[PDB]
Amino acid sequence: MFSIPPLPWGYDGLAAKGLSKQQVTLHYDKHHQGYVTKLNAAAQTNSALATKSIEEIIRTEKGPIFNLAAQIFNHTFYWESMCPNGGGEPTGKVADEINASFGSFAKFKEEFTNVAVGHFGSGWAWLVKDTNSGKLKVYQTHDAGCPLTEPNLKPLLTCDVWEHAYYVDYKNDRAAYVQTFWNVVNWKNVERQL
Amino acid sequence: MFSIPPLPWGYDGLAAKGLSKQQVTLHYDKHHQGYVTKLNAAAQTNSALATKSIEEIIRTEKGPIFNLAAQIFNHTFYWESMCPNGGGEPTGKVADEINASFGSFAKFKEEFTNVAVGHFGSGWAWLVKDTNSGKLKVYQTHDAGCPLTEPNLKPLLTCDVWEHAYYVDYKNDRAAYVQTFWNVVNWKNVERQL
Ligand SMILES: [Fe+2]
Ligand SMILES: [Fe+2]
Ligand SMILES: [Mg+2]
């Protein structure tokens, strides 16, 4: 049956950097695990699904079943995109590729910030590498939208901007939440996805 | 400049019935009033907007400006759809129209509940009247979607199911929040909209 990996850094791992044990706990135990529970129920009454992976489902299914699998993938990628020892600017190959695609880190950061803060309704802000060209791009998905449906767009980083991701700690202030996201970006994970 | 009417029953009006001073205050002062502030900002940039009514903007504009006006209307309709002395089962005209369209109040309640609880992402659950047939229907919109963009459709009632509407008091439990909505439904307002 479907399961998800534990938080890489534990329920309180980001508390000192502005995502509280309580915010993270609700987000993981209620929202993320809830999607897993719902997908497992759906597989009992849709036998085709029991043999598909999360990724296979995202690529081949649509509607509510897609939303469950995609939300599972997106949330796991989101926790892996954050780290208590992250933040600041990337170095090495990640820095090189960001500079080549966006001009500078500051320009990349402005574009991602404005997309993340400006996304209307529930969604996800992404950094992706478009393997059609090699160029990095800022990209947003709506609701459970997942870059895997556009197979050229390799995911590097995501920030959940569903209100449930930040409302506990930040209430309506998504801008403040995104500033916090920058303080915890896991550049090591981004480098692994290149 | 654009403005919104005050809450009909005060910031703490629904607290005894399950929507707290804090939940309602954030929702009205930050989100609802926030949309008004943003629309007025847009109107200084574009003077043609400033003379249009909220409903005119909803019918004619698209994109971000639409989202602002539609959210302004949807939220006012939402506050008018609730009342501390409401809840329970309607009587008179509204009851007759609900019974004629859905068979019974119980059947209507079950349909509206399931649409409201099941809406994926940000959105709104509505009771509307088709003005061609007079028949009432449960109708959902996504994000800022508003029944006024559809032909021959009059809004009667709405429940906001964006996560900010319930996350302070209910967190992930939207089902519990919708049960609370049922305890405050303003059937007097629905009667005025028939
Ligand atoms: Fe989330
Ligand atoms: Fe709202
Ligand atoms: Mg993985």
Q: What is the DSSP string of A139-171?
A: EEEETT--GGGSTTEEEEEEEE-SGGGTHHHHT
d(CA B167, CA B188): 27
Comparing CA positions, the residue from B105, B61, B76 lying closest to residue B3 is: B76
Contacts of A164 in chain B (CB under 8 A): 163, 167, 172
Q: What is the resolution of this structure in A?
A: 1.9
d(CA B111, CA A96): 54
- DSSP string over chain B: ----PPPTT-TTTTGGGT--HHHHHIIIIIIIHHHHHHHHHHHHH-HHHHTS-HHHHHHH--THHHHHHHHHHHHHHHHHTB-TT--S---HHHHHHHHHHHSSHHHHHHHHHHHHHH--SSEEEEEEEETTT--EEEEEEETT--GGGSTTEEEEEEEE-SGGGTHHHHTT-HHHHHHHHHHHB-HHHHHHH-
Beta strands at A135-142 and B153-160: parallel, antiparallel or unpaired:
unpaired
d(CA B177, CA B62): 31
- Residue A123 tokens, joined: 């969604």
Strand-by-strand arrangement of the B136-142 sheet: B136-142, B123-130, B153-160
Contacts of B20 in chain A (CB under 8 A): none
B162 at interface of A, judged by CB pairs closer than 8 A: yes
- Residue A35 tokens, joined: 């999607």
**CA–CA distance from A96 to each of A28, A132, A135 (Å)?**
33, 18, 11
Residues with Cβ within 8 Å of residue A27, at least 6 apart in sequence: A75, A160, A164, A165
List residues in chain B that are followed by a break over 2.5 Å (C to N): none
Burial of A97 (0-12, 13-18, 19+ CB in 10 A): buried
To which H or E segment does residue A34 belong?
helix A33-44
State the best of B35, B65, B114, B120 to mutate against chain A, taking most chain A CBs within 10 Å: B120
- Residues A186, A193 contacting (CB under 8 angstroms): no
The three-class DSSP label of residue A46 is coil
- Residue B91 tokens, joined: 């009587």
d(CA A86, CA A182): 9
Comparing CA positions, the residue from B38, B33, B27 lying closest to residue B64 is: B38
Experimental method: X-ray
Picking from A31, A120, A164, the nearest residue to B143 by CB comes out as A120
Picking from B30, B122, B168, the nearest residue to A121 by CB comes out as B122
Chain A closest-CA separation from residue B99 CA (Å): 31
> Residue A160 forms beta bridges with which residues?
A124
d(CA B183, CA B17): 7
Strand-by-strand arrangement of the A123-130 sheet: A135-142, A123-130, A153-160
For the packed helices B105-118 and B174-184, what is the interaxial angle rounded to 10 degrees? 140
Contacts of A120 in chain B (CB under 8 A): 64, 67, 143-144
d(CA B77, CA A28): 34
- Residues A161, A138 contacting (CB under 8 angstroms): no
Radius of gyration, alpha carbons of chain B: 16
d(CA B194, CA A37): 42
Q: What is the DSSP letter of A62?
A: -
Residues with Cβ within 8 Å of residue B117, at least 6 apart in sequence: B174, B175, B178
Burial of A123 (0-12, 13-18, 19+ CB in 10 A): buried
Q: The domain containing residue A151 runs over which residues?
A: 1-194
d(CA A164, CA A146): 18
Comparing CA positions, the residue from A120, A66, A65 lying closest to residue B164 is: A120
Radius of gyration, alpha carbons of chain A: 16
How many domains does the structure of chain A reveal?
1
d(CA B161, CA A111): 29
Contacts of B29 in chain A (CB under 8 A): none
Phi and psi dihedrals of B110, rounded to 5?
-65, -45
Comparing CA positions, the residue from A154, A149, A120, A162 lying closest to residue A137 is: A154
C-alpha B46 to ligand 2 mean position (Å): 26
- Residue B42 tokens, joined: 């847009």
Phi and psi dihedrals of B160, rounded to 5?
-70, 125
Q: What is the DSSP letter of A130?
A: E
Say if the Cβ atoms of A122 and B163 lie within 8 Å.
yes
The residue type at B68: L
To which H or E segment does residue A127 belong?
strand A123-130
Chain A closest-CA separation from residue B159 CA (Å): 16
HSE on the CB side for B118, CA within 13 Å? 11
